[PDB]
Curated annotation (Swiss-Prot):
It comes from Homo sapiens (Human). Keywords: Cytoplasm, Disease variant, Isomerase, Mitochondrion, mRNA processing, mRNA splicing, Nucleus, Phosphoprotein, Primary mitochondrial disease, Transit peptide, tRNA processing. The chain holds residues 81 to 399 of 427 of the full protein. This is Pseudouridylate synthase 1 homolog. The keyword Kinase does not apply. The gene is PUS1. One of its GO terms (biological process) is mitochondrial tRNA pseudouridine synthesis. GO terms for cellular component: cytoplasm; mitochondrial matrix; mitochondrion; nucleolus; nucleoplasm; nucleus; transcription regulator complex. GO terms for molecular function: chromatin binding; pseudouridine synthase activity; RNA binding; steroid receptor RNA activator RNA binding; transcription coactivator activity; tRNA binding; tRNA pseudouridine(38-40) synthase activity.
């Protein structure tokens, strides 16, 4: 068949993988590459050396992180029923949701939306509220969450909201368009809520730390003043919420728009992404265990 550049819109539940791209567990790309080879889209040696098919990914999602709207591009043999055939070789929790052929000169993924799905007891005041799963989020606690998240909006020095081996880079200005928390919902006694953040050029661990600091403040481990203070020059030990709850929702970019795929994106998030996170919180208590680490931070 004819060789063409294509762009795929893909989604995955991230549990059980070591991330999108190989740097332990297989990666999302291992599953996609195997499906590409099995279906004959690409020859075996392009699976062995992915550079040979000009494979590119928009977002290098970390261990355990999910995605409703990852985007990749590569060159394939454009076989009949290509989309169905690739999906037929993937587990149910990884899906190609859209597939378009583009010009060989289709090279843009820094502008992004993520959500973070977490048990609401992440917001329970350590002293004043019950800490178990009967906790219910008050209108007032949610106000507070939203007020603090709103503080992130705009442009700030986020040097305390990343990590690294070397010393801390004293300047890491970044832009946040929006950040808020939705009203909670309950599944079998367990209450959750979805935080959404839209921004640009997110750094490693930045969203997890942004969520982690607001959890620490709201639960009562740190004063609200730490948020403004963390913009300052001084190092602050910012708590890093787990990767489990994080979902890459959208990459915002020859132009490219996935509007007709929004229904499938939504459905896959509801059917595959959210249930795995909720299931893991219910059965493995990831959040509850992480919250118990908060006292080690010196505020
Ligand atoms: Cl990530």
């Amino acid at each position: 068949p004819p060789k063409r550049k294509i762009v795929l819109l893909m989604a995955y539940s991230g549990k059980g993988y070591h991330g999108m791209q190989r740097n332990q567990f297989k990666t999302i790309e291992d599953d996609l590459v195997s499906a590409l080879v099995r279906s004959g889209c690409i020859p075996e040696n392009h699976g062995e050396d992915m550079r040979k098919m000009s494979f590119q990914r928009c977002a290098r999602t970390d261990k355990g992180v999910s995605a409703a709207g990852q985007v990749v591009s590569l060159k394939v043999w454009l076989i009949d029923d290509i989309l169905e055939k690739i999906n037929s070789h993937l587990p149910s929790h990884i899906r190609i949701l859209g597939l378009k052929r583009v010009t060989g000169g289709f090279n843009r993924c820094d502008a992004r939306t993520y959500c973070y799905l977490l048990p609401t007891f992440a917001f329970a005041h350590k002293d004043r509220d019950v800490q178990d799963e009967t906790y219910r989020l008050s209108a007032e606690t949610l106000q507070q969450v939203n007020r603090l998240l709103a503080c992130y909006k705009g442009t700030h020095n986020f040097h305390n909201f990343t990590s690294q081996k070397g010393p801390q880079d004293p300047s890491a200005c970044r832009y946040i368009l929006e950040m808020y928390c939705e009203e909670p919902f309950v599944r079998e006694g367990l209450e959750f809520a979805v935080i959404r953040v839209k921004g640009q050029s997110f750094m490693m661990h930045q969203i997890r730390k942004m969520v982690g600091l607001v959890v620490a403040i709201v639960k009562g481990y740190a004063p609200e003043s730490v948020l403004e203070r963390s913009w300052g020059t001084e190092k602050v030990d910012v708590p890093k919420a787990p990767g489990l709850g994080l979902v890459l929702e959208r990459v915002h970019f020859e132009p490219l728009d996935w509007a007709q795929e929004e229904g499938k994106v939504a459905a896959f998030k509801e059917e595959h992404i959210y249930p795995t996170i909720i299931g893991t919180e219910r059965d493995e208590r990831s959040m509850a265990q992480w919250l118990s680490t908060l006292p080690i931070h010196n505020f």
